[PDB]
Ligand binder design. Structure first.
Ligand SMILES: Cc1cc2nc3c(=O)[nH]c(=O)nc-3n(C[C@H](O)[C@H](O)[C@H](O)COP(=O)(O)OP(=O)(O)OC[C@H]3O[C@@H](n4cnc5c(N)ncnc54)[C@H](O)[C@@H]3O)c2cc1C
Lengths: 133, 670
């Protein structure tokens, strides 16, 4: 009915291998060269990746800064507000990054700041300034 | 099957349906009411049953009606018509049986049968039992032809036919019951022995043995799919052979092995390049982190009190460094998960090769074995038709004749006019009758003329193929006959008989294979036979090897035989053989080969063409269409059972019926 379990006999491959006198060994040699070609390509990219891994030796451990967390405070200080304004200038609408810089202000408090002091800190101008870069 | 249906089966007939044969003789019944057909069928089956239950004595019409019940014994003309039909066509009262009604006082008609092979002898017995004058002309000094049996003392080995291929529906089952006939079963266990350098040959482990054989079967079944479903039957205006197709199948399996490997290594590289691109990003990110750490460190060293912009710089660079260290850990996690997938892929490669040198050698033994069965290289067998007779194979385990297969023809030859040492040179057939011209084989100048009504030609196909002809036909055989002779394949296989003074092999093992070194010589002494308490080993030469081995002296052959035997049973425990016999069937002028095969470009239809009788032209021009004169029996003339003893036996029975119908008339249509 159909080829035995694991026997491969497509209409296409039959015509291709029968096409001429030595079409058989042509197709088989073509894949043998194809095979050794990919094998040497592996050996190479394995060596390239071996070299690149050696450049990453040590990781990023000397450059890891210790974790500093303080309680997420409610009160805005003059000092903190100014940090915020600068963070808006640098990061834009990245409420997360801005929150991380200030330290003790939640992502919502930052969003509140954006609308509370919207007039007084010209946050409109500040945001369009960031988009210029 | 069992009962009256068992009898129909044993006679190669459907129990519940009328055959084309029967439709011809009983057209009234088969075109008529369904009821009467079932009546017919029972009568037919019951008569067969009766015959088969006791084939040692003749079954008469009276004795048949005797054992019939109502309403089957009501219509006695139908019972007679059936009995006579079954009698004519040799379905009842064939072989060697005690006659109830002694032979007719005078004979009607005269028939010359060429060759006293089994087909000849079978027909001769029948024609004689139908009250005809029969004389067989045999070139050899013995009956049986391709049923040859070497004898010495009590030790016996068949150089010709040897295996009875199952008793279920085999006409030989009847013959064996009719005679002494001691049949011995064949233990199908066959260990294979491959070379091991200077060391003794190692038995192939059940691991490989079973996997290669199953691959062999799978390869055959694959060629069958390739033939039927894909129609790969003609290639460059030439018919595709089995070996031709097997190559294509094997090649496509190697292609697959390579295709699987390519896409596996290509699955590696695409990940090996994912790793490459990730490692590059990681190196660059480490560079920006290194630079950003310095920038932070510098900004952080501007000691308080700082103004808010200097304060922002510290906090800003700090946040940014944590964000880039966040990114590096994502990429470091991916790196490990890619390296883990890279080992996964490299731990599970696909199949290394399709077949190793060791495998392909064992597979070639299985091919050689198939070349032995079909008595021909697989490059000669028709892809589409080589196996057309597979459905008609008998049931039951295969057996051998203990006292030597020639037992059978000799027993069939009893009470027949057989002229031995008489080689037919020319067959003349005309409207008025026939004359057969033969010479004495011993002195070929001594000539013999035989005048007869009909000639039955049982000459082997190989003989019929000879160029220039060994037998001449006057007038020549028509194009349609000669073309069939041409197209049909007539193969070859040979046997070597090895007589030793002592049994040095495993006495409980019936047969063991030897694995050859190359494809070229896969058939060369590829298998060894052992049976009785007799110390004979029987070496088999098959495929392309058979033909070439015939051009090699007995000594060299016996040499190669011992070499292989030493290589298995120890280079010392193998004595010199006392008696050796080497068959050469292709060289034998009364055979010119071993038996037929379905050649590429032939088909089962050519076998029918072979059986077709010849009707000569009219003597006086304008005279009516004459009787058929020249008739053909033999292994090569029976579509459903070619290349066998039973097939020959049946072909003989067939012709005897056709000749009787033609020259004695059909008494059952009266
Ligand atoms: C090596 C071998 C092994 C075999 N093994 C088996 C087996 O295991 N099982 C199986 O079922 N079958 C087997 N067979 C096949 C079987 O032997 C034949 O199919 C069968 O014997 C054919 O009978 P036949 O009468 O058609 O031909 P034959 O038996 O050849 O009869 C033809 C006769 O005509 C004679 N003759 C030839 N030329 C002339 C002439 N010019 N004048 C007068 N007479 C002539 C021949 O000598 C021969 O006696 C085997 C055959 C061979 C060669």
């Amino acid at each position: 009915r159909k080829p035995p379990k694991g026997m491969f006999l497509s209409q296409e491959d039959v015509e291709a291998v029968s096409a001429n006198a030595t079409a058989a060994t042509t197709v088989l040699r073509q894949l043998d060269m194809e095979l050794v070609s990919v094998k040497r390509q592996i050996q190479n990219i394995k060596q390239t990746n071996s070299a690149l891994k050696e450049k990453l030796d040590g990781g990023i451990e000397p450059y890891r800064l210790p974790e500093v967390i303080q309680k997420c405070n409610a009160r805005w200080t003059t000092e903190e507000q100014l940090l915020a304004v600068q963070a808006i200038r640098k990061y834009g609408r990245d409420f997360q990054a801005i929150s991380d810089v200030i330290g003790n202000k939640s992502v919502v408090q930052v969003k509140n700041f954006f609308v509370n002091y919207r007039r007084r800190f010209n946050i409109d101008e500040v945001l369009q300034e960031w988009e210029a870069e | 099957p069992s009962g009256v249906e068992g009898a129909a089966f044993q006679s190669r007939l459907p129990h519940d349906r009328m055959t084309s044969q029967e439709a011809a003789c009983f057209p009234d019944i088969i075109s008529g009411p369904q009821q009467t057909q079932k009546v017919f069928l029972f009568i037919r089956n019951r008569t067969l049953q009766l015959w088969l239950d006791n084939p040692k004595i003749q079954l008469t019409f009276e004795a048949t009606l005797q054992q019939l019940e109502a309403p089957y014994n009501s219509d006695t003309v139908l019972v007679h018509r059936v009995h006579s039909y079954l009698e004519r066509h040799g379905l009842i009262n064939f072989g060697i049986y005690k006659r109830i009604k002694p032979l007719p006082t005078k004979k009607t008609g005269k028939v010359i049968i060429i060759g006293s092979g089994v087909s000849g002898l079978a027909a001769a017995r029948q024609l004689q039992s139908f009250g005809m004058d029969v004389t067989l002309l045999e070139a050899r000094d013995r009956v049986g032809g391709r049923v040859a049996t070497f004898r010495k003392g009590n030790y016996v080995a068949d150089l010709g036919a040897m295996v009875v291929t199952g008793l279920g529906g085999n006409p030989m089952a009847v013959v064996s019951k009719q005679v002494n006939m001691e049949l011995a079963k064949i233990k199908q266990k066959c260990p294979l022995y491959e070379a091991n350098g200077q060391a003794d040959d190692v038995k192939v482990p059940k691991e490989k043995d079973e996997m290669v054989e199953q691959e062999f079967n799978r390869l055959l079944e694959a060629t069958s799919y390739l033939s039927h479903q894909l129609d790969f039957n003609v290639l460059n205006n030439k018919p595709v052979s089995l070996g031709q197709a097997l190559e294509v199948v094997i090649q496509l399996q190697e292609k697959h092995v390579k295709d699987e490997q390519i896409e596996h290594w290509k699955k590696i590289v695409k990940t090996q390049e994912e790793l490459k691109e990730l490692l590059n990003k990681m190196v660059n990110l480490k560079e920006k982190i290194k630079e950003l750490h310095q920038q932070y460190k510098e900004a952080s060293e501007v000691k308080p009190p700082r103004d808010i912009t200097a304060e922002f710089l510290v906090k800003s660079k700090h946040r940014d460094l944590t964000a880039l260290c966040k990114e590096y850990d994502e990429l470091a996690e991916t790196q490990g998960k890619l390296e883990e997938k890279l080992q996964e892929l490299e731990a599970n490669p696909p199949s290394d090769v399709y077949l190793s040198s060791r495998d392909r050698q064992i597979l070639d033994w299985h091919f050689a074995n198939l070349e032995f069965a079909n008595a021909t290289p697989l490059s000669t067998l028709s892809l589409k038709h080589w196996d057309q007779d597979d459905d008609f194979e008998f049931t039951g385990s295969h057996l051998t004749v203990r006292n030597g297969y020639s037992c059978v023809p000799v027993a069939l030859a009893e009470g027949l006019d057989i002229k031995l040492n008489t080689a037919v040179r020319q067959v003349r057939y005309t409207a008025s009758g026939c004359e057969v011209i033969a010479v004495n084989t011993r002195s070929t100048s001594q000539t013999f003329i035989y005048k007869c009504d009909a000639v039955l030609c049982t000459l082997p196909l190989g003989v019929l193929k000879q160029q220039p002809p060994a037998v001449q036909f006057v007038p020549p055989l028509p194009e349609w006959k000669t073309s069939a002779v041409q197209r049909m394949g007539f193969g070859n296989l040979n046997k070597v008989v090895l007589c030793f003074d002592r049994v040095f092999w495993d006495p409980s093992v019936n047969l063991f294979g030897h694995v050859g070194s190359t494809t070229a010589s896969r058939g060369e002494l590829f298998l060894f036979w052992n049976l009785y308490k007799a110390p004979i080993l029987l070496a088999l030469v098959a495929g392309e090897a058979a033909g070439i081995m015939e051009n090699i002296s007995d000594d060299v052959i016996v040499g190669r035989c011992l070499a292989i035997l030493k290589g298995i049973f120890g280079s010392s425990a193998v004595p010199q053989p006392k008696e050796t016999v080497v068959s050469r069937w292709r060289a034998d002028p009364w055979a010119r080969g071993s038996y037929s095969y379905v050649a590429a470009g032939s088909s089962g239809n050519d076998y029918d063409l072979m059986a077709q009788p010849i009707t000569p032209g009219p003597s006086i021009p304008g005279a009516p269409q004459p009787i058929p004169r020249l008739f053909f029996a033999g292994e090569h003339t029976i579509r459903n059972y070619p290349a066998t003893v039973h097939g020959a036996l049946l072909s003989g029975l067939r012709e005897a019926g056709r000749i009787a119908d033609q020259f004695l008339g059909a008494m059952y249509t009266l």
